[PDB]
């Protein structure tokens, strides 16, 4: 994984929010969180083949702090269709 990466996972706060690995300007993973950082701490030591694969390929992480766990809920699904990332389920 990038070293900027690495950093930008270990600063994230206990907030709920939205976050998008990108590669070239492209999305390939959009999740949700109740809190950011323990979601995204997860990728550091991964359970699966995907998330192993996603945190090698991305050169980007984009995070977006919502207000509730409502918002989040509908600005991930919403995201989800308008992108149609390679790592998300269709
Ligand atoms: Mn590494
Ligand atoms: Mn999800
Ligand atoms: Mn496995
Ligand atoms: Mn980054
Ligand atoms: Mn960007």
């Known amino acids: ?3 900027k990466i690495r950093k930008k996972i270990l600063l994230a ?8 690995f990108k590669n070239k300007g492209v999305p390939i993973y959009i999740g ?19 998330v192993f694969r996603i945190g090698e ?14 918002e989040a809920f509908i600005l991930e699904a919403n995201l989800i269709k308008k992108y149609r990332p390679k790592y998300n389920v269709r």
């Open 57 to 70: 390929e991305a050169d980007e992480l984009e995070t977006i702090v919502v207000m509730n766990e409502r």
């Open 1 to 3: 994984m990038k070293e």
């Open 13 to 20: 706060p206990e907030e709920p929010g939205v976050y998008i």
């Open 32 to 50: 949700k969180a109740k809190r950011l950082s323990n979601r995204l701490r997860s990728f550091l030591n991964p359970q699966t083949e995907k």
